[PDB]
């Protein structure tokens, strides 16, 4: 078991 | 059979000049993972994470 | 530098320390989408 185991915003055109 | 033999030779040549003993493959003692690496947020009112 | 050649980014010999492998991988992978 051990082996096996900024702001996002829309963009517009200016 | 000859491939097994060549692999055995290659495995045996390493242990002579690598300071790693072959009897360490068994676990006479087991390490324990640190607590924060394990999932533990907090303990409140007998809660166990 | 001489075995690789000219870089299409700036237009001269490749500068020392430029990751040509990542650039090649990306330039081969990105056309596969279209």
């Amino acid at each position: 078991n051990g082996i096996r185991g900024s702001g996002r915003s829309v963009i517009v055109v200016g | 059979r000859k491939d097994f033999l060549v692999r055995r030779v290659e495995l045996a040549k390493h242990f002579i000049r690598t300071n790693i003993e072959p009897e360490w493959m068994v676990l006479c003692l087991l390490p324990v993972l640190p607590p924060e690496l394990r999932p533990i947020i907090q303990i409140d009112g007998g809660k166990l994470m | 530098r001489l075995c690789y050649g000219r870089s299409p980014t700036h237009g001269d010999l490749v500068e020392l320390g430029e990751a040509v492998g990542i650039i090649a991988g990306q330039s081969i992978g990105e056309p596969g989408t279209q």
Partner: protein
């Protein structure tokens, strides 16, 4: 032109039953050896 000659070697290996004690065994004020888990319940 001589390079800066930076040298870093990351080595991997299998631990020994003697080296494993160098991680968990710590000193105490009274001097008793500690580092072993002997109780099943943690909380």
């Amino acid at each position: 032109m001589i390079d800066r000659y930076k040298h870093q070697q990351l080595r991997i290996g299998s631990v020994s039953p003697q080296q494993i004690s160098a991680w968990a065994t710590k000193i105490l004020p009274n001097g008793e050896i500690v580092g072993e888990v002997t109780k099943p319940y943690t909380f």
